[PDB]
Symmetry: C5
Subunit: 357 residues, 5 copies
């Protein structure tokens, strides 16, 4: 038998196969099963609020028509051109941008027709989808990105979309992301859509991403910590040289604020206060406080010199010098402990919060 004659006889002009009519017309809804494979992942940034993912989509649906039953081979592979003739289920994404088809040399379309008439439709597309990311705790957070598939033109009746029981979602082997760690759970659930026009079927896929904490520490935590240590050490020493101390304090504050502003640049603007903000604020507060401590000591010293200028003045010389020294000596030991205890408190609360969430 010739292949060409069969190929046109099955889906051509002699065949009553109209691509405008749904299969099993005036009948029970056509069940469609969807299998998704992730070729690659990437392009995730906070400002953009979207992720670009390359995916291979497989759609399988039963067709009573086109059941030739005259060829020994179980299935027949077919060309991309043949797909236009066949009836195709509509697919839409709830948050779809871009998604242009790849057409290098030939369109990337695969058609397989089984003897029973089950049809496999395969396409490769790059989807950019909006992700409603959570910016609550910037250093450590878990982000879930959801992909939703709906039927734009058909109601719940006459077309139902279902997930594949085994191997519904696959991922490319040895695929990694520089910023996030993908979690191997991939929970899938389906939520129907209600509109004024009607009720439309939908299915959802959920992906969990974990941030890598390594970059943030080196980029932000380490410089701030070194700055804080420098300020404290320098402030405690060179007490007699008051211009030297005040100049150091002010420069340290200026660097702290500029660094904090620099830190808040890559991410977008939100009303709520992030953990990084909290850390910057406390560090700035400590650096701020140090200068006030020096100012108080300088004021007390000024009082001592003026009164001395005014035995009766050595009656108060020991008192004022001892008081000022008692301030400096206590402050010097006191501040790192009252900083270490906060640092420990901060890390433990965030660690338990991440563990429970």
């Amino acid at each position: 038998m010739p292949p060409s004659e069969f190929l046109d006889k099955l889906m051509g002009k002699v065949s009553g196969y109209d691509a405008r009519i749904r299969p099993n017309f005036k009948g029970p809804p056509v069940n469609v099963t969807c299998n998704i494979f992730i070729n690659s992942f990437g392009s995730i940034a906070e400002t953009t609020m979207d992720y670009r993912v390359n995916i291979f989509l497989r759609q399988q649906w039963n067709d009573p028509r086109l059941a030739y039953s005259e060829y020994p081979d179980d299935s027949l592979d077919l060309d991309p051109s043949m797909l236009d003739s066949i009836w195709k289920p509509d697919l839409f994404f709830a948050n779809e941008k871009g998604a242009n088809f790849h057409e290098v040399t030939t369109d990337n379309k695969l058609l397989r027709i089984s003897k029973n008439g089950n049809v496999l439709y395969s396409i490769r597309i790059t989807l950019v989808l909006a992700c409603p990311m959570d910016l609550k705790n910037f250093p450590m957070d878990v982000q879930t990105c959801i992909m939703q598939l709906e039927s734009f033109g058909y109601t719940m009746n006459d077309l139902i979309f279902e997930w594949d029981e085994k191997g519904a979602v696959q991922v490319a082997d040895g695929l990694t992301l520089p910023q996030f760690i993908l979690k191997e759970e991939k929970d899938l659930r389906y939520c129907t859509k209600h509109y004024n026009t009607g009720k439309f079927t939908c299915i959802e896929a959920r992906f969990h991403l974990e941030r890598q904490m390594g970059y943030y520490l080196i980029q932000m935590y380490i410089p701030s910590l070194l700055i804080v240590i420098l300020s404290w050490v320098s402030f405690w020493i060179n007490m007699d040289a008051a211009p030297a101390r005040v100049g150091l304090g002010i420069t340290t504050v200026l660097t702290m604020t500029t660094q904090s502003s620099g830190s808040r640049a890559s991410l977008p603007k939100v009303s709520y206060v992030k953990a990084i903000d909290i850390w910057m604020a406390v560090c700035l507060l400590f650096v701020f406080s140090a200068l006030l401590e020096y100012a108080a000591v300088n004021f007390i010293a000024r009082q001592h010199k003026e009164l001395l200028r005014f035995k009766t003045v050595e009656e108060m010389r020991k008192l004022f010098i001892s008081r000022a020294k008692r301030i400096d000596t206590v402050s010097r030991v006191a501040f790192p402990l009252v900083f270490l205890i906060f640092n420990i408190f901060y890390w433990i609360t965030y660690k338990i919060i991440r563990s429970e969430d």
Copy 2:
């Protein structure tokens, strides 16, 4: 009865349905009713002066022709391909950029034909529209963005566009914007368009947006305030160390001006003066003034030392030292009160202005 034979018989070659002729030709204008649903909102920035909104557009118009009256089911769903054959009303937007149709797998088009011949036409498109935003008061403002729909090719006679009395505009459930809060009023009004060629119908939709004040405070108000406090405190203490004071003042001024310039970067250039500008200017003025106060005190001290170099000089020693001290002592208490009163005045006037507008 076969579906295919009916489907071509209704809108094909045997039917005199020409897609080049308006329905009810030489007759009263065709009333078209439009329903708009907002899938998503986003991409609003001052420099761009545009907003990107994903929308679902439903157009309903009465057609005397295509009233088959031979099928028991009330309405028939139809394919996107069928739409080209049917006559379609022209739609244009007064400020339209981009707006390319989404065509993933199949074009996102829905056609529903009722027995009476009313036709529902549904399309999903992303429109970028210019918004004439008001930049009067940068921290707190209400922005209204308007969307206008007009008929490019047809005059007021032979095509009229009207709003749906109930549920004219719907919004996606649980839809939020990071920067703005959408207001649930959505006032709709229609303004006709007059041109040299003729009079064309139009309809307008108005959306109200409220800025979130949380980010601006942390980003700008808090650093400026800390800087101002540091400068005042430091200036009042370490009075004897004049190089220390002058150096602090100058560094503080330099940070103030650079921060102000940095603040004026995200937004575009306008002739009028914004509230943020006013706040930066007063803070800079206070920081500026402090240095002049120190300079005056230093000059008086210089006069005291030169005259002393010249009892007759202790006749004026008490006077000059007392005068200089009286300056420093009064200035020190005086400046925060004369700053707090302004801050209170500023916030109350802006709060009443936002409330009334």
Copy 3:
């Protein structure tokens, strides 16, 4: 009479109307009149050297053919599809980039055919055109942007383009630009084009734009002026504290140069020197000079102390102290006047120059 039969009879297969033949073939050139309406203006920046303008273009030309003379109504509105059949005059822009047609729902095309056969062709397009902007005086300048329309395929003979005597160019009501003020003159002139291939008709439209001076003052003039005042005041006071003075001078210079470099960033690079450059250079020169004045005074003081170390030395003590003081006292009063006179000179010359140009 049926509309469809007439519509194909007028411009179809029975009609000898070939869209490949120019009307009035072997005859006098076809006069075409063009009317332009500006929907919106915007996107003007120095670096890009182009402006994006949305425009509605109306082309009117006389056609002897298609003069039906059998329908009572004076004119017939026609669909966009009908336009392809009709012969259309070629239009080109001398400096055209982009200019993609807007095609939302239906193509934005209007066709009107009068009984006499005059044809009105209407299109809406967004044109990006290069503008040869003048960057001579950055703060105040008048920019003229020219739009040129030419016939790419046809010579001067057989197609002439002319302007409409009344209402040739219209602008959208209540249309404003944030940076520039449009001038309501809109002088139109036409210049023919000569090429090796032949002579081609062209028409030109000129638009005048005036810069808003409000933003530039606040952004650049005010910070530089405050810096200059601070430097002068601080330099004159705290004369005894030489490290304090030198440190202030150097920091002030560093801010001046960085601010000047920052200023020269938004605009492109040009050989000629702009007014803003002149202002920055003089301000930098004044700030520069101040330090040299302090250095000279310090050198004289050094000479006084060394000679004193060497009555015979109080013979020269009064002379050296008086000379140094005479320098500081004169310099202090002298510099603002010699700055105010320049500022007055600068503004008056630029104001007269802008007024005359």
Copy 4:
């Protein structure tokens, strides 16, 4: 004989050549040989993680059909239009983005048909491909970029892709890259692909790139080194002037941290620590240490002055002054040697590592 009659007779309606049927149907897989020539290379950046390469692709496959055997000339050149009629093997790239065909004047397609029926298919395309670059050692690294060719629609059976034994990959003469040096090895290997649908043939090409070290030294190594030298020299001198020393140290630290942050900007974020990070950290540590050394000396000096204020005090004057001087004198000579030895260690270990890898 006429050329036109032959040209349609060979591949037209009288010929049974259907472009929907694979050659040698129900037969051994069709061997396809691929030759690749690199027109140009460029656009390689770390953030993008992709490279843009212009390539000329030659596909040669045996066809039993179209073996005319009636023309004396060995091969016939054919037009791009003729290609659509012929059956064409599908080609896909594992990591393909963009890759739009170039179509200036005519499509860039070459067809050559030999007498035996071997067919040469030639196309020019620009491919952007993701490269999994290694960011372990930023200054010196070797990057390998892989290009993979697979058959999307056909399994391993019925289409096999093989490399050309001689001159498989050619490069344009005199082609250079500013950043990287291409290595003339170009190892080619093929790895089959296994999927749920089936087994698909693939071939891989590997390119080796070597970074140029010249820019990085001047940009980063030289400024850091000069800064370190300045800090050490300045710290050792001007020991009596403690405010001068502390101010120098702090400014030097501030520049070091800002420079380090600036350095980490061009490249993306990764968890692991790069060599440049290690170099910045040690330099910052040295600069940091210097200040602590000065602080310790200042503290000892303070102890000496307080005890002196309290012979019995000249019993300890020599001891304290000698101890402080012994610190400064040893530290001064000690630090460059303990810096030179590290620098030598660093360079030798990286040089051996690059040589072995």
Copy 5:
């Protein structure tokens, strides 16, 4: 005679003119002459390494067929639609990106057919081409950009491309570039291309560009020079105030390095060292040296004070003070001369190098 009947008779179905056959088949190669006119030039930047040029391309080739010889007029103008029917020579560019055709209202195509059958084909296109720019000497350099035209599908035999003897390349009148000055030489040469497939004809056009030196001086040379002068002057004065001197030196160095880094930003990274780099390095070296000179003087002064603390000490007081003063006095006069001589040497060598190259 009717025009339509002739127009289809010449190039239609009755005519044996097949657009798939080369003219003069089995005959001598078809000579094609190319004329290029430059509408505009622009978009040249170092990072991009490409230039965008708008060009009008004229192709003239002899056709024996289509020689009607029955119309009195010498040449017939024809529509863009007619071009598809005619055989067209393939054109390709060696380094072509973008180059999309402009299609506003009508496609910008001109066809002219002479009586002898010579055919003129005219197209307007914007070509972005890679330019292998030389970055050896950044301030002054001459850049040559080459445009190459080749035949993708045809070998040297059967299609030859040649230049027009007179007026081969024309430029638009009054066309200027802000950065570069075009040179009116425009040397044209042709180099054949050899490939594995065959030998292909090519032609090349060379354009010479000269940089404008005005911007670079103001942007970079002037600030560096002022900084150098400030540092030298300030260092020489205020010798007794060592903290003041060291602080000035360090701040000056910090500005120098940041300015140098800022300078190296607009351009890309290259291994070789540019002239601007050389200038920055020497200026940094001078500024660096000054601090070391001050440190040496301070060390000598320290030696003098310690020995004095230890007549026998006034035996060495004169010697040490005289030596330190001799250093400062010589250094002060010595450095500008040893800077002026270098500046003169630098400019003369670059000027002769530019003149000879």
